[PDB]
């Protein structure tokens with residue numbers, strides 16, 4: 148059973164700007180998604196300080212980067228707090244309407260796309276490199292769900308029958324044909340070292356057969 152939703156107009160406009168603006172510094176998508184994972188891990192860690200049972204769904208707090216050249220996907224997995232169905236529908240747990248308003252003002256006031264994370268909407272930088280994004284998520288208080296969008300003004304949500312996750316979020320980037328450098332080990336390592344060197348969780352770059 149698949150539910151299809153329209154993006155709020157302001158979010159559709161944000162996505163269109165990300166997809167259509169000429170902007171060469173696309174590699175920041177990875178910094179933004181790793182930062183979101185770190186924020187999600189901080190949240191479950193904080194809850195666990197007063198309620199250790201919050202980690203019954205998984206004690207390890209980490210980030211995995213999983214390239215797959217056969218599927219043309221880069222997957223960012225974290226064991227953070229995850230998202231409820233309501234969070235997914237409400238712009239993946241962001242205040243994206245107000246964040247977009249500020250971001251678009253800043254761009255007209257001199258800012259560039261790399262600054263997107265200062266406005267709480269860094270997730271959408273995935274569309275710098277991905278033609279489709281799938282988000283699989285499991286929060287302690289809800290079931291496992293899959294969100295997906297190829298932009299174009301709509302997203303879907305369905306219960307996920309795939310591999311159970313325990314707790315956290317998996318962002319699957321279905322890369323554009325001309326963006327496959329982001330599956331190359333040396334390129335990913337370079338981006339992590341440049342932009343994510345102070346993230347306080349282990350970031351494991353998986354290798355391929």
Ligand SMILES: Clc1ccc(-c2cnco2)cn1
Pocket residue numbers: 164165168170251254259260261263271272275
């Ligand atoms: Cl990641 C990103 C890329 C482009 C823009 C933008 C806004 N206005 C023109 O381009 C914002 N964020």
